[PDB]
């Protein structure tokens, strides 16, 4: 992605404060609720009929944590996004056949979640930096589509 030296410092400093479990569980949960068609990929997780059942589902929280941990790998390897997500790109594109637009949706949902947990500390300047990182992850995951 390549951000100013100062930006990296700012992005990395916020991530030291992120609880992958809380944040991930909410991010994946909101995705399932705000964009219901994403539910099709998780029918095995169980009852996702309503927001209360979705936020409470234990598999949603568990898979949510895994996803956020993956973002963390991206945040600590901003110089090599392509190589960092190569395997996940094959899984999501070739094997699961997920449309690339969804990666961006999850990226923005993630940003909204961070905004809700850090409030005023999530300044418009820090967010701008995070839209770059998030945009970066999305393209790398969509790399197998090219």
């Amino acid at each position: 992605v390549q951000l100013s030296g100062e930006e990296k410092a700012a992005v990395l400093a916020l991530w030291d404060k992120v609880n992958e479990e809380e944040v991930g569980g909410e991010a994946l949960g909101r995705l399932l609720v705000v964009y219901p068609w994403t539910q099709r990929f998780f029918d095995s997780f169980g009852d996702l009929s309503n927001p209360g059942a979705v936020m409470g589902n234990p598999k949603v929280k568990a898979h949510g944590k895994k996803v956020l941990h993956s973002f963390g790998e991206g945040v600590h390897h901003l110089d090599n996004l392509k190589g960092t997500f190569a395997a996940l790109s094959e899984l999501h594109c070739d094997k699961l056949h997920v449309d690339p637009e969804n990666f961006r949706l999850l990226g923005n949902v993630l940003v909204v979640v961070l905004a809700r947990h850090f409030g005023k500390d999530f300044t418009p300047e820090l967010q701008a930096s995070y839209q770059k990182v998030v945009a970066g992850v999305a393209n790398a995951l969509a790399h197998k589509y090219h």
Binding site: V33, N108, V111, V113, P124, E125
Partner: protein, 141 residues
Amino acid sequence: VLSAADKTNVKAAWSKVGGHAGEYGAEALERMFLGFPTTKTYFPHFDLSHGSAQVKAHGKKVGDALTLAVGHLDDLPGALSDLSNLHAHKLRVDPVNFKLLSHCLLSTLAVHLPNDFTPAVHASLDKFLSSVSTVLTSKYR
């Protein structure tokens, strides 16, 4: 299309915004200009510096326009008729930019109303903004 549950969610959440619609509009715009530089292209005559009084003034217009939409969920095409003609025919704004402003509005709302910005609310507010974006980009009826 907004359902009944969505209309109720929107009218309720906006009750929470209360008289802060204008401030949130300004922050939304400030987040958009720094987060997606391309949008500045549309404001060559504005002073986009930080804390600009020009951005605060405009942010207020946007805030009011949205409070107006919340009052006419049953007929958005009619209540926003003039804004549509301005954004689609004169300005010719690329529809993509509306998604960017909507995401910045939601982000701004998550920051100020952390306890009221639930999943359900988040979901309805998003249908509402897409619905308003549809009207403003259409050369419709």
